[PDB]
Amino acid sequence: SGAIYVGNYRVVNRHLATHNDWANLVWEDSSRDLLVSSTTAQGCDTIARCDCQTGVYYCSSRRKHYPVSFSKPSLIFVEASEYYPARYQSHLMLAVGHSEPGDCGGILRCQHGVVGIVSTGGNGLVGFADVRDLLWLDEE
């Protein structure tokens, strides 16, 4: 589980979005596993605006933050899960590292701020949904 809180936006894994999120939906892309809902309070996360390929992600299933190299956001084939059929997830970054399903929402961060959230992985990989193209998260 986990979320990014930037301005009056909450960014979650689409597959973990709650009832209030949809009701309060701003934007969702099933192909990115992202959902942004509206918030009453102001968030204090900074979104990275960069092409960093190194960062640190939180792994709830190890209670540990791991330094990782990761691929640039790409269209990647992702095996079926309980939440999605087998399909090409867009804007997805892979690293070698431990993840289990429940680690989705863990932040990946570089020196510039939040890069993305754990979305997929397994067999020693972890996939992160990029949020760094979502320039509108920083305004309105």
Ligand SMILES: COc1cccc([C@@H]2CCOC[C@@H]2N)c1
């Ligand atoms: C971060 O998310 C993860 C991490 C590990 C495994 C999975 C699921 C396990 C079931 O088969 C589909 C996926 N590979 C997701």
Ligand SMILES: [Zn+2]
């Ligand atoms: Zn960066």
